[PDB]
């Protein structure tokens, strides 16, 4: 909606003027840290958005697609004023959103949760290696950019496409935390862009991701009934903790 | 264009009232110090704290009433009554409460029968089935209720897709449509539920060896996800249904899959 | 297409007036080329880049766009030399190998796609040598329309048209010019950067003559496009190689 436009211009008050600790704003120096290291992910505290106001943290609960967004262009215009450049950089910088309790752990999840950002743990299971994805498309002409997508691509040219890597990572549960008498039930891990190549096989990883399902997708064969695919898409990761 | 009109459901409307009414009257056996008032108002209004969308009713007061003559049409027939039992208690609820997906669930039946005596006449009713779990399976939604459209462009219609296809919304559309067309998937609108799948085996103890024991699979739908442990015998609520997986449908393969509303770790 | 007619009238007086004081190192390398049947030639980048920055930026740019026509800009020179009147002569491989930055295979992530990168890695194995085409006739099953397709590189579907269809033509291969291929497969040198995970091996496929240039197990250095296809295994993920040209392995090697 329009009316979220105005949103930004209160959340962009809290990407750069926010203080903590006696001065010295701390996303400040996140934007200028990459900034210099140029690594393309600002990285946001849950903690701080949610100390200024519950308001959004309860939208980060409800609806995390659409807003997310509509925060990393506004990310990307703080880092426009406080360096006067990355239009040849990245054009995109999407936010890495640090720990979000929430904590449901593996085993225990529901509806609920679908289409609201939920953080996970457990240990990684060996991971497919780095396929770029279609993302954007563009060409000479010749219709215009198409975005596809996450993930159908329903309903190819390419000239100049803006490649990003996938990559598909299983999440086991952890071993030690299996309540006796169960089987450590595991779900699908989406990675993407810096968020690739972080994890390692046999360790245990923090993940942000929102949760998702589409698209039947495929069984209708072996279920007996319409039963979606349950995929969670990353957005951050880091070590146990 | 009018549709003219609906029919008849005859029956099941005299269960609807003879339902809402037990569920609303007393269903009180003990007085002085009870157990009395209600226990169902007070039931729902128990429920009205964590507001888990579930509910919890005994057979055995359930065939008091009319001596069991009501618990027929509940108990052969009952698949027919599904959508009366749930939406009916709806129309109790919205008289006396303040978004709704209702898990109904019967327990506690007369008697529990094994997968052996598992019947093609059972079907369509509640049967109590003990026996051990095997092979778990991780939780994944159900379409339940789906707007698939548009299908052809703006549409947007919202309804129904309740049984287990999915194919196909967009049929006899929008008004008016006349898709065809895409279906088209729209898993935003669409509520889900549970669910996770557990092959129940029978017990090894009756099981008369040789006999290599027959299991068969048992879906949970509801709050009574998660409930089930493997190797630990447990008892359901019956509603045995069929799966596809003999004639044809001509201008179809089919085996026993059981379902179960309700869930207890008795056995 | 005069703008093509504008790059190959670029490449040309590339060719023909480029001086290293003072042999002409290109058209020379070309005549000592199809004198010994070689029909190939390695352009140097930096004499390249010396001569024109231009051509390089767009080379740069949409690689497998241009390039072809840098090989038919070559072989229209060869045609002046090799031969004078008033057949058949292919259209030459270009090699270029050269200096610029060189790239580890770990740090290859999207993003350089489809632009050429140098590196650097040990051979695991060399697949057998298979045919893909350049010049191929074709007739339809109908009407028998005769269409000599000239295929090019860098897959590409049939023509359906002249009921008739869907895909009514058929390959000639009495009249067919084929080329060779060969698929290298090259893991990345075990100093780095291994760590403590087995190391990636990236797919390439090499072609005409720089086909058996090297046998499994040599260090070497590629150059070669990025590109990548698609060969069912969703949703996308469509999984890299990287097209060489050309090859040069390591000193010496012979």
């Given at each position: ?15 750069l ?28 505290n849950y ?22 967004k ?118 699908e ?53 | ?78 698949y027919?009554?599904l ?16 978004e ?10 007369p ?121 630990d ?7 045995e ?13 089919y085996?026993?899959s ?9 056995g | ?14 060719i ?80 270029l ?17 489809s ?75 075990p ?52 097209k ?11």
């Amino acid at each position: 909606p329009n009316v979220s436009r105005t949103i930004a211009r209160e959340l962009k008050s809290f990407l750069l003027e926010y203080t903590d600790e006696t001065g010295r704003s701390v996303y400040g120096a996140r934007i200028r840290t990459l900034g210099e290291m140029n690594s393309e992910s600002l990285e946001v505290n849950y903690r701080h958005l949610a100390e200024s106001k519950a308001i959004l943290a309860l939208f980060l609960a409800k609806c995390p697609e659409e807003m997310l967004k509509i925060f990393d262009l506004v990310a990307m215009e703080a880092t426009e004023l406080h360096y006067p450049d990355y239009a040849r950089i990245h054009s995109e910088i999407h936010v890495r959103i640090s720990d979000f309790p929430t904590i449901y752990s593996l085993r225990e999840l529901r509806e609920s949760n679908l289409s609201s950002l939920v953080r996970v743990t457990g240990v990684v299971t060996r991971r497919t290696g780095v396929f770029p994805q279609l993302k954007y498309v563009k060409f000479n002409c010749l219709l215009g950019p198409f975005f596809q997508d996450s993930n159908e691509e329903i309903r190819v040219n390419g000239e100049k496409t803006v490649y990003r890597n996938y990559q598909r990572v299983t999440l086991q549960e952890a071993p030690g935390t299996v309540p006796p008498g169960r089987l450590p039930r595991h779900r699908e891990v989406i990675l993407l862009a810096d968020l690739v190549d972080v994890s390692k096989p046999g360790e245990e990883v923090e993940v942000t991701g929102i949760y998702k399902n589409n698209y039947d997708g495929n069984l209708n064969a072996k279920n007996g009934f319409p039963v979606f695919a349950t995929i969670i898409e990353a957005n951050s990761i880091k070590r146990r903790e | 264009l009018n549709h003219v009109k609906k029919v008849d459901d005859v029956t099941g409307e005299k269960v609807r009232e003879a339902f809402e009414q037990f569920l609303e009257d007393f269903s009180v056996q003990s007085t002085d110090t009870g157990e009395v008032e209600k226990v169902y108002r007070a039931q729902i209004e128990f429920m009205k704290i964590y507001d888990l969308n579930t509910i919890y009713i005994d057979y055995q007061h359930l065939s008091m009433r009319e001596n069991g003559a009501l618990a027929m049409a509940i108990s052969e027939q009952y698949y027919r009554f599904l959508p009366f039992l749930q939406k009916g208690l709806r129309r109790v609820v919205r008289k006396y409460a303040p978004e709704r997906v209702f898990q109904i669930s019967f327990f506690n039946l007369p008697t529990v029968h094994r997968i052996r005596d598992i019947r093609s006449e059972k079907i369509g009713s509640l049967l109590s089935i003990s026996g051990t779990v095997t092979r778990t399976s991780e939780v994944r939604p159900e379409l339940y209720k789906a707007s698939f459209t548009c299908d052809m462009c703006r549409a947007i219609v919202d309804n129904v897709e309740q049984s287990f296809k999915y194919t196909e919304p967009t049929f006899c559309p929008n008004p008016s449509c006349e898709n065809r067309a895409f279906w088209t998937l729209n898993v935003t609108r669409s509520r889900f539920l549970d669910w996770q799948k557990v092959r129940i085996q029978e017990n090894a103890n009756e099981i008369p060896t040789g006999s290599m024991p027959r299991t068969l699979d048992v879906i949970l739908r509801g709050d009574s996800v998660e409930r089930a442990k493997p190797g630990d015998r447990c008892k359901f609520t019956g509603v045995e249904i069929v799966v596809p997986d003999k004639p044809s449908s001509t201008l179809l393969t089919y085996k026993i899959s059981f379902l179960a509303c309700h869930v207890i770790s008795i056995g | 297409d005069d703008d093509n007619t504008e790059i190959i009238k670029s490449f040309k007086n590339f060719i023909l007036e480029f001086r290293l004081d003072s042999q002409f190192i290109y058209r020379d390398q070309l005549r000592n080329n199809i004198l010994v049947k070689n029909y190939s030639l390695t352009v140097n980048m930096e004499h390249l880049i010396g001569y024109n920055e231009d051509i390089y930026k767009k080379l740069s740019d949409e690689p497998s766009d241009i390039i072809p026509l840098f090989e038919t800009a070559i072989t229209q020179v060869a045609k002046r030399i090799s031969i004078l009147s008033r057949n058949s002569l292919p259209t030459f491989q270009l090699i270029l190998n050269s200096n610029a930055n060189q790239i580890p295979l770990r740090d290859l992530d999207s993003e350089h796609v489809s632009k050429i990168v140098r590196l650097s890695g040990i051979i695991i194995s060399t697949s057998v040598l298979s045919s893909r085409a350049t010049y191929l006739s074709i007739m339809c099953r109908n009407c028998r329309h005769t269409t000599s397709i000239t295929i090019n590189n860098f897959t590409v579907s049939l023509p359906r048209s002249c009921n008739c269809g869907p895909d009514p033509y058929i390959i000639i291969h009495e009249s067919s010019k084929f080329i060779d291929q060969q698929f290298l497969k090259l893991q990345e040198i075990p100093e780095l950067v291994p760590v403590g995970e087995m190391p990636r091996n990236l797919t390439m496929t090499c072609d005409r003559y720089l086909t058996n240039k090297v046998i499994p197990g040599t260090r070497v250095t590629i150059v070669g496009i990025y590109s990548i296809y698609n060969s069912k295994n969703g949703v996308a993920i469509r999984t890299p190689y990287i097209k060489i040209l050309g090859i040069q392995s390591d000193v010496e090697t012979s």
